[PDB]
Design a protein around this ligand. Structure first.
Ligand code: MG
Ligand code: MG
Lengths: 370, 370
């Protein structure tokens, strides 16, 4: 009855309102692998296979995830009750190692299908509610000084964001630094400024310039250097006294443990997609919390479905103690979720209702399908 | 509707079939604090606040737990929806630090009441099911060589336990070692033997006598020394090459992390009661698993309700990778649960049905109620 009859995966290409530039690429649209789990009782659960723009972030892409979901992961679920969630996730490991991003979609789809079948929010399968609204940090892709300052002013006045994250890593380090430092002198008094270089600066470059950003008021350095170099993340804090947030360095529980042991970061960017599901995400939080490391409700620039899965997680996870950056839906020029999220006064309310708390619009899903 | 209207706690004194001897005390009965969460919709949930025999183990007793449950934890629940489980557990921390055994009762009770209202097993609020039966190690309290050998032989034939745990710590260490050493030469071949001294041997004594039990075939040394001394746990494994299981050393996630950093134990005695609830237990499991440490579904000698809770935890947690010792109920002269656990072939099946999958027989509850 609660059996899984079928699992489908659709690649969706949705355009962004503005070009979102990273250290080495620029997105004009997000690619989302919308995965669905179809249960015998007719209910359909949805999950997202999504990374920030492309495989430049970590090696997985919508194409890569569909090949894995379709050809290896999905076939494991078929013929089993969705109420075997934990056991199925464990069996996925036997057919596909790593590939957490692909797995996260299967996990979320199963949670949705199950929570709707039981007629409850997805968070009630994750411990209940701790909060009904979270803070949201607004991230700006790489933008010229004037454009950035302008976008911050607009955001402050229209959405109330009290914190902003500035992506870096494109072009010359000395100029990139100047760009951010200057922007900090014009905004650092009204809001909390953080940066993120997506591991595209080498250790020497980070240790040389980050001090300049620290003096300018930047309060948080997200993954400025390579994911594997935990000693360097620790060293940049030693020399600048400003917190570091690990992102590409932490995908798995084992990697969260490694950061704890290396005292490599004050904060961990927790993303339900990158960790390979809501179950894995709970593990990241447990480890971080035990080592005294704060967790941020981070985003892989998920669409409405993915963002809703992450908000349900934040709603039930006390260890998400450093707000979030779950603004994905806002970056999209259009959606496919029927309902709308409520972003006001620097926050966003948790989606009330069964499943993720938001339903898909099959017309728009079909419209944006590749 | 899901509103917690009332929370009650009763001390239950249930007789044991045989006296259970520990390192410094001998129990003729087990004390259990039965906590019930009463919801608006009329559904009631139960959880056990229980320690092995008494306060000698860790400072908490049925009396201490009742004082805290009735006078501090309970008031926090009243007027709130049980669907706020996680947030309620966080707020308990504001009025009572530590006291994990007392808190575990509140956590299990809410999960029971909550799962019943949604008409699902408790495991369904913890990820679903990975297994439906678990191995069971049978523990023998302190007993003369003959009485011990006899029991093991008997259990093997009647219930088929394939592993046995021998309690130590009473009287002379040398004699104690000889006692176990000899029992090993008579049974060690057929089954897996483990010991537990409940932290009642000092470092020097453990390092001196444990090699003898190692040479005699004992495969696991459970907490033979003080909870605080992790380096000693590490050192006994270094000199004997036999795995250690941390029990009194690990109650909280931070303590589990400390054991990981100290490489102090190969296995962690995971008890839903000692950890302060099902939520906390999940955390223990996540940290252990990330560090490669195995988890044993251990027991605080809970009654049928507690054991059911721990069985639901084991059904949903792949991290429980070293069997369990959830034989608690079998030690009681009688029970207050209507149904009965299915023991056979050295295992026990996970109870099916809503809540803990086991209903309390109020008539028997009232009969053993102090
Ligand atoms: Mg990042
Ligand atoms: Mg023990």
């Amino acid at each position: 009855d609660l059996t899984i009859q079928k699992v489908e995966s659709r690649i969706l290409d949705v355009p962004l309102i503005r070009p979102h530039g990273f250290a080495t690429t620029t997105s004009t649209e997000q690619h989302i692998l919308l995965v669905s789990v179809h249960l015998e009782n007719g209910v359909i659960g949805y999950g997202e296979g999504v990374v920030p723009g492309g495989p430049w972030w970590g090696g997985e892409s919508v194409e890569t995830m569909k090949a894995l979901v379709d050809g290896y992961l999905a076939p494991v679920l078929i013929g089993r009750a969705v109420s075997e969630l934990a056991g199925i996730m464990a069996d996925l490991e036997r057919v596909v190692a790593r590939a957490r991003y692909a797995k996260a979609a299967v996990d979320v789809a199963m949670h949705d299908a199950w929570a709707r079948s039981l007629n409850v929010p997805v968070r009630d399968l994750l411990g209940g509610t701790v909060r009904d609204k979270v803070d949201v940090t607004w991230a700006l892709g790489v933008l010229p000084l004037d454009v950035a300052v302008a976008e911050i002013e607009e955001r402050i006045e229209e959405f109330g964001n009290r914190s902003f994250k500035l992506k870096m890593g494109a072009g010359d380090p000395a100029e990139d630094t100047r760009r951010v430092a200057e922007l900090a002198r014009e905004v650092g008094d009204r809001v909390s400024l953080r940066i993120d270089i997506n591991a595209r600066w080498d250790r020497r470059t980070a240790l040389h310039y980050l001090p300049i950003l620290a003096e300018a008021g930047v309060e948080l350095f997200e993954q400025p250097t390579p994911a594997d170099d935990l000693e360097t993340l620790r060293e940049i804090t030693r020399r600048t006294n400003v917190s570091v947030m690990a992102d590409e360095s932490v995908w798995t529980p084992a990697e969260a443990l490694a950061v704890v042991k290396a005292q490599a970061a004050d904060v961990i960017a927790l993303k339900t997609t990158k960790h390979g599901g809501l179950l894995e995400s709970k593990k990241i939080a447990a480890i971080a919390e035990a080592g005294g490391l704060a967790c941020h409700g981070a985003t892989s620039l998920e669409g409405p479905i993915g963002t809703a899965a992450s908000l349900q997680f934040a709603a039930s996870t006390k260890a998400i103690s450093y707000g979030t950056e779950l603004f994905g839906p806002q970056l999209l020029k259009d959606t496919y979720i029927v309902q709308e999220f409520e972003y006001k006064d620097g926050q966003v309310a948790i989606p009330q209702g069964p499943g993720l708390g938001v339903d898909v619009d099959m017309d728009k899903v079909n419209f944006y399908t590749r």
